[PDB]
Amino acid sequence: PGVTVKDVNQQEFVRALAAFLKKSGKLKVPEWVDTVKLAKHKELAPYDENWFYTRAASTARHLYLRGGAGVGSMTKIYGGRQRNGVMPSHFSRGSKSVARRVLQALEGLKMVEKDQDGGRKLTPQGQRDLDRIAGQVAAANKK
Amino acid sequence: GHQQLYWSHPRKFGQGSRSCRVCSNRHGLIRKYGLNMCRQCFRQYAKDIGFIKLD
Amino acid sequence: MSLVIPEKFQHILRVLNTNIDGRRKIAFAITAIKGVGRRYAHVVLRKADIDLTKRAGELTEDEVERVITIMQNPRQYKIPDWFLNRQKDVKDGKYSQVLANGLDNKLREDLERLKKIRAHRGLRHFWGLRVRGQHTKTTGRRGRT
Amino acid sequence: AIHRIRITLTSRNVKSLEKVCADLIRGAKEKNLKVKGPVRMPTKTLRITTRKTPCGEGSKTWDRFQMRIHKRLIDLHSPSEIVKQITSISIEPGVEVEVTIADA
Amino acid sequence: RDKLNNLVLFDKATYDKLCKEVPNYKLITPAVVSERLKIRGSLARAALQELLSKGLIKLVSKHRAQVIYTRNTKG
Amino acid sequence: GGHVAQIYAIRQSISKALVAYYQKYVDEASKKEIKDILIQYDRTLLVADPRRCESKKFGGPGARARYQKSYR
Amino acid sequence: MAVQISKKRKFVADGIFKAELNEFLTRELAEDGYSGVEVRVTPTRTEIIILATRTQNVLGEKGRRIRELTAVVQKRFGFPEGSVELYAEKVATRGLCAIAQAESLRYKLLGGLAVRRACYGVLRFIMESGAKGCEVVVSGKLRGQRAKSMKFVDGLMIHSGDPVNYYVDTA
Amino acid sequence: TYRGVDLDQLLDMSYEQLMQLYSARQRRRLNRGLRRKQHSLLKRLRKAKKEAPPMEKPEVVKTHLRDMIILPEMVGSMVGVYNGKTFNQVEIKPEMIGHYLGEFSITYKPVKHGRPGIGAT
Amino acid sequence: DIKLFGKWSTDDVQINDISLQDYIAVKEKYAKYLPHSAGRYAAKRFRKAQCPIVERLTNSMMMHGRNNGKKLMTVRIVKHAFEIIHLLTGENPLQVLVNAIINSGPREDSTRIGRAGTVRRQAVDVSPLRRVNQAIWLLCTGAREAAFRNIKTIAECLADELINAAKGSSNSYAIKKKDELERVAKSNR
RNA sequence: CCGAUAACGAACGAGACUCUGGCAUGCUAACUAGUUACGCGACCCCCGAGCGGUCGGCGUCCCCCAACUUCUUAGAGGGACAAGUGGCGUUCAGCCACCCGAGAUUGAGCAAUAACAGGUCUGUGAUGCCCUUAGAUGUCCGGGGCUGCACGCGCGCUACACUGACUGGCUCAGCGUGUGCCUACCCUACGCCGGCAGGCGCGGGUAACCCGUUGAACCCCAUUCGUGAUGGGGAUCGGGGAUUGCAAUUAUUCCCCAUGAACGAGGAAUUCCCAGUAAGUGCGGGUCAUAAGCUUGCGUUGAUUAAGUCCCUGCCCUUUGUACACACCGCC
Ligand SMILES: [Mg+2]
Ligand SMILES: [Mg+2]
């Protein structure tokens, strides 16, 4: 009964993934994680302290879903709704430096490799890590 | 005046940099698909180009 | 946590030259000071190493004076350059965050400087009209009639 | 050879393209070159909406216009070399053709 | 109807008031706790999850915008 | 599509696939006496809703609403 | 490829060329019974066919004028030399061409003939040519300064739907 | 003082190290090449200033270009800035450096409202 | 067998009056697992009559500009309100809703055009479908103004709205408006 | 339309027409679209499955080196006609309900005579007449203005909040564009720098080939806020940082940090709207060197109410009254 990340609910999955990332802390965390907003359209920084680990976990899951996602792709996922105040709203994208630092940290832990063309994907042992954590969170969620 | 000021004003862009390809109008231009034609001239010639009504 | 209100839970504080309510959360209580906002409060509390889930009345004096030290002197506590209000002053060109009625008199001296040099923005400020080029034809009727 | 060419046909109407695509492939079958099937690409509907009035007075009546560009792709592929056999066009006015090879 | 001036932290007067009869009736929501105990409502949520931890409140819904509790079954 | 239209597409597709599978690979007795429950429970489980959209006109904000008019 | 513009732009340019050529031929061949223009295009070259009643008159002495217009269209749009030919062809039943009939009526009016009898003669010739019906409208400063409009119509004439497109010529 | 430096240092403050002291718009403007008319006008004001009588304010110079950023070496000149109708003379203060010439020759006189007319009945 | 929202079997819910039993659709033929079915019930007259009244509430509960497409939130509000009312009362929530609709229907109204005495000239008895329509609309309106500028969230307001209407205590907007309309119709007889 | 009939024979309009949308596992074709099967793999289960699960990872139009078009595309066609039943009907024209059916009323375009002193000579090398024509009402160039503000009105937008806001996670579209005759101005993947606005090298696309599997918004799931003018609201206003341009001031646009004003649902009045409709919600195209609170379309969520009426506002026919005929804004 092998468990893929698709057989577990992705929200507590990425929650436990970020928790494992926190306890096994080897990330190249930039010093400005305490200052920057996660996007241009945001007006508050993320409430979580080690939100960087959570975002890195989410990016790893997205690379599992579909590879070759460069910085612009990931900001398109992490884009959001810019309220623009009195003028009618639109849509904005995520922070390019934030996603780029997340990526450079992800191949900091070499769980991500750049592709032959543009963008980067997950290495097989990173796939192994994701699947192992999916199985363990499946065991926890079940029992 | 001499050439130094007769046409020295730049028009590499902006509305004055475009005229109708039929009547040289500077209003109601349509630049879609490189039409470069006056709106009224478009409505006049739309049969001739081939834009026809189906709805 | 979820215990009784502390004995030293002052309801409002006295910060610099203004008071702030301790009943709300700390992340938003100090924003009542003119020149302080949500983002600035967030960063100074994060760099203050003080819990954000607790009210401003239940803090202790060392914590609040740490906040005072950070607010008055943010450059030396790793605040980046672009986060300050009075950046590159017209008087002395020094990067400073201004925290109190100093901001009020700094705006005052900027406006009187603009009037003294007879700038168009200063002229519109003296006349009370819009300075950013907004249309006055239909709007701004409330302040006059 | 060995030649593998691509021929594409487009116009603004449907009848001319269909009749060219039919008679051309019939001639191809009479000339025993195996034919890759007619590939009908999605139609480009160039849509232009414009106010009916030329002055702006009235009921703000907008007239929209359409131009439908249909195109078809037919590959001619033979073990023998192609262009020396087939050179004739028999092309009516109004329809567009492009002669490309597998190199192109 | 002018204001509510609700308490943000418990005192001695309301802490035991929360403790002794709140897990005795049917419906327990932050709304009813705040409206019948004159507390803020964030304090209501905090107290409710503390009493969840204390094991004499049963949860039924646990939704992000509407959480419902009840007393334990008696009898 | 969206999310709930996605849900309805999936449920219709599964229902239609099962009735086709039971029509082909086994007798149509089972096919009919599952299609009955499908029909007199939910006709839309086997019949797609033909309504898609409706075009906006050049005198209103949507397909049928008109822009607000004034006289004075 | 990069040198060639997209198919959308190319078809737009084709329509533009059709419109410009029609306008130019109308403005020049107005007195010579111009009816319409048809162009046949190939990658090797293009063929231009000008439908006109007076082929003998639109052509100059020994084809001088057709050569003139061929050189004009060669230079104006910048084709390669010898990549365009212009043929003059007589239309069939010029009574049915509303373009040619409108040009004839315009000539008869500019010559000084009365509008009433000229319109009657044009309509009579059109119906003698054989058609389901015809309609002419004259608007302008008839009689005095104040504007008036005449419509002289006979036979069958629809107004609505698709079939009016390919059943009634409009000029 | 403009940025903590005195104007005496500003006279020998060359353009490239000055662009750090100006604002972003002014820095971009000087980063772009200044054209011939601006240079000629600077030559004009420098000529007038050197030939100006000692301890006396210079003679007036007129111009239409009012997009010129005020340079610290032109402080004290008599510039006639076009308003659309006339040329307006105004002092160049030691505070006006980051300011444009059009920012002091107003193009309109402020409106004094009288009794409304037939409109808004 | 149906167990709408996973529980609360419909078969024990019984309509007390024969007046609206042709227009309450909680029966097992109209009982559904989840109140969402874009069945085009407004395409034809009297097709909403066969629509389950829970779905009718769900349609009628999402209003007021900010809520014209937020039907999922409406369904979740319905589910939480059903949970709340069953915890508060202990019986079948659907029974509570049916009783609230029955007690919320205003049995007659008044309408006319000419010179009215107090509100309208003539008194008119109403149809059961209009009874159901007015009941649901009054309930949604009462809950909406019950939850606008108070801490008590919309689920609780809808819950006690249904609770008070299922019995009748002069405490809910729906039955108060019903009594006002009936008194006026009594006056305009 | 049936009928009667001093009318008969017609005609236009409507209808008929074309597109649009809905069913076609019916046909044709699909390496610029896919489906299935297989083989490489990689990872989980390996306790043990192994024809276990995932793959938008790699291949099988690389030419012999798998099949098919269900999904996608676009053509020829079919398919719905009041066709059947029941009821009403002079038993005719027709109408209601129902069965089967994708569909038993899909929205548009076109749209008659006649007319308005309705708008355009500021679209035209459309044009009559009049005015000007060298100190020009021609034309060019420079600047200003068209934004200007005691005030009134219109079209919209934001909003007034817990059916909410912020923070994080999860997750689904379709129109349609994209490098130029003049004409300089394209859509963009990836990699790096920066916090953002931006900058720096490499590519792809003249396009079902690249952006792009258009990872949109709304919505959904957890978090904090707690009924306050509060974390709603971001107008005003200061500083600073980026982009376009010859030039950004009366701020072009964008970013950041400060300030949070009125607004607690709106009088007398009045607007639009009946099913994928209103409304919420984002996205395209136009304008564009820079750009959308506008507009045209597209897409997502998806309702209450009604199957009637002339009460008001009007409209069509017939009769009747007139002193109206510039036609009741009449005339007197
Ligand atoms: Mg018709
Ligand atoms: Mg805030």
Q: What is the DSSP annotation of G20-69?
A: HHHHHHHHHSTTTTEEEEEEEE-SS-EEEEEEES-HHHHS-TTSHHHHHH
Euclidean distance between CA atoms A46 and H111, whole angstroms: 50
Distance set, CA C68 to CA A117, B49, C57, F41 (Å): 52, 74, 15, 69
**Residue C24: both structure tokens together:** 């709300």
* Residue G159 to residues D65, G50, G100, G162, Cα–Cα distance (Å): 20, 29, 22, 9
User: In the structure encoding, which two tokens stand for residue F62, read together?
Assistant: 């949507």
CA distance G123 to G128: 8
What is d(CA D44, CA G95) in angstroms, rounded to the nearest whole number? 39
Pairing relation of β-strands B29-30 and B37-38? antiparallel
Whether residue I157 contacts residue I86, with contact meaning beta carbons closer than 8 Å, is answered with no
Domain boundaries, chain A: 1-143
Cα I15 to Cα B32: distance, rounded to the nearest angstrom: 65
Domain count of the fold of chain E: 1
Q: Name the β-bridge partners of C25.
A: C55
Residue with tokens 């293009």: G46
CA–CA separation, H33 vs H30, rounded Å?
6
- Region of B43 please: left (phi>0), alpha (psi -120 to 50) or beta: alpha
Alpha helix stretches (DSSP H) within C14-119: 26-29, 38-46, 61-72, 101-116
Q: Which domain holds residue D4?
A: 1-104
Resolution (A): 3.9
How far, in Å, CA of D13 to CA of D48, rounded?
Answer: 18
Nucleotide at minimal C1' distance from the A99 CA: J195
**DSSP 3-state of G117:** helix
CB C34 within 8 A of CB C102: no
- Annotated binding-site residues of B for Zn(2+) read 20, 23, 38, 41
Q: What's the Cα-to-Cα distance from I11 to each of I14, I28, I94, I101, rounded to whole Å?
A: 8, 7, 10, 18
Q: What is the 3-state secondary structure (H, E, C) of chain F?
A: CCCHHHHHHHHHHHHHHHHHHHHHCCCHHHHHHHHHHHHCCCHHHCCCCCCCCCCCCCCCCCCCCCCCCCCC
Strands G84-89 and G46-52, bridge-based pairing = parallel
Residue B31, phi then psi, degrees to nearest 5: -100, 5
> Which sign, positive or negative, has the C-alpha torsion I68, I71, I76, I80?
positive
Distance, CA of B31 to CA of B18 (rounded, Å): 9
Question: What are the angstrom distances between the C-alpha of E67 and each of C125, C126, E60?
Answer: 53, 55, 8
Which of the following CATH numbers is that of domain G7-88: 3.30.300.20, 3.90.1150.10, 3.40.50.300, 3.20.20.70? 3.30.300.20
The DSSP result for I106-126, as a single string, is -SEEE--SSS-SSS-S-EEE-
Residue D35 near residue D74, CB atoms below 8 Å: yes
The domain that holds B41 is classified in CATH as 4.10.830.10
**Contact: D10, G43; criterion CB under 8 Å:** no
Cα first-last separation, chain G: 40
CB pair distance less than 8 Å for E29 and I153: yes
Residue with tokens 């801490």: I151
Number of domains in chain D: 1
Ligand closest in space to the Cα of C37: 2
Main-chain dihedrals φ then ψ at residue A31, nearest 5 degrees: -70, -15
Nucleic strand J contact set for A 24-53 (CB, < 7 Å): 30, 32, 35-48, 51
Q: Residue H102's closest CA among H94, H114, H117, H90?
A: H90
Nucleotides on chain J within 7 angstroms of protein Cβ: 11-23, 25, 28-30, 32, 42-45, 47, 49-50, 52-54, 56-57, 61, 63, 73-76, 102-103, 106-115, 117-120, 123-126, 140-145, 147-159, 161-164, 166-173, 175-185, 188-199, 206-208, 212-213, 215-231, 233-252, 255-260, 262, 264, 270-283, 285-290, 292-307, 311
Q: Tell which residue, I56, I61, I62, I1, has the closest CA to residue I33.
A: I1
Compute the distance between CA of residue D31 and CA of residue F11 in angstroms, rounded to an integer: 51
Residues 67-106 of A with CB under 7 A from strand J: 67-73, 76-91, 93, 95-98, 100-101, 103-104
Q: In Å, how far from its chain's centre is CA I182?
A: 18
The maximal CA–CA distance of chain F, rounded, in angstroms, is 73
3-state SS, residue D78: strand
Interatomic CA distance for residues F40 and F31, integer angstroms = 14
Q: Of the candidates I141, I144, I151, which has an alpha carbon nearest to the alpha carbon of residue I178? A: I141
User: Residue C22 to residues C31, C46, C56, E4, E11: CA-CA distances in angstroms?
Assistant: 12, 18, 4, 17, 16
CA proximity to I58, closest of I17, I97, I92: I97
CA–CA dist B46, I94 (Å, integer)? 64
Element housing A76 (H / E): helix A71-77
Q: Do residues I3 and I33 lie in contact, with contact meaning Cβ atoms separated by under 8 Å?
A: yes
d(CA A99, CA A59) in angstroms, rounded, equals 8
CATH level 2 (architecture), domain C12-77: Orthogonal Bundle (1.10)
Contact criterion met (CB below 8 Å) for D52 and D30: no
Class of residue I28 by CB neighbours under 10 A (exposed 0-12, middle 13-18, buried 19+): exposed
Decide: I30 and I51 in contact? Cβ < 8 Å.
yes
Q: Is-contact D53 D3, C-beta < 8 A?
A: no
Nearest to B33 among G12, G19, G22 (CB): G12
**Binding-site annotation, residues of B:** 20, 23, 38, 41
Structure tokens that stand for C68 in this block: 């005072």
I72: tokens are 């999922």
Q: What is the CA radius of gyration of chain E?
A: 12
Nearest of I124, I89, I94 to residue I107 by alpha carbon: I124
* Distance between CA atoms of residues A139 and H74, nearest Å: 78
Instruction: Give the end-to-end CA distance of chain D in Å, rounded to a whole number.
Output: 17
Q: Of C84, C30, C89, C77, whose CA–CA distance to C56 is shortest?
A: C30
Pairing state between β G84-89 and G133-140: unpaired
Alpha carbons within 13 angstroms on the beta-carbon side of residue A122 total 19
Please state, in angstroms and as integers, the Cα–Cα distance from residue B8 to each residue in B1, B3, H29, following that order.
11, 8, 21
Exposed e or buried b per residue across D77-100, where buried means at least 16 C-beta atoms within 10 angstroms of its C-beta: ebeeebeeebeeeebeebbbeeee
CA atoms of H97 and H86, how far apart (whole Å): 23
Q: Which residues contact A58 (CB under 8 A, 6 or more apart)?
A: A14
What would the two tokens of residue I19 be? 């007046």
Supply the range of the domain harboring residue E64: 1-75
Phi and psi at residue B37, in whole multiples of 5°?
A: -125, 150
Please calculate the CA angle C30-C34-C39 and round it to the nearest 5 degrees. Answer: 55
* The total number of residues written for chain H in this structure: 121
What is the rounded CA–CA span in Å between residue A3 and residue A142?
Answer: 12
Q: How far are the Cα atoms of C11, C26, C68, C71, I94 from residue C100, in angstroms, in the given order?
A: 21, 18, 12, 10, 60
Task: Name the nearest CA neighbour of C13 among C52, C77, C65, C54.
Answer: C65
| Phi/psi of residue G50, nearest 5 degrees | -105, 110
Contacts of C81 (CB under 8 A, 6+ apart): C87, C95
User: Domain span at residue I85?
Assistant: 1-189
**Which long-range contacts link F48-54 to residues 24+ away (Cβ below 8 Å)?**
F48/F12, F49/F8, F49/I38, F49/I40, F51/I40
Residue with the two structure tokens 């010579």: G32
Which class for G123: exposed (0-12), middle (13-18), buried (19 or more C-beta within 10 A)? buried
Q: Who's near I186: CB < 8 A, 6+ residues apart?
A: I123
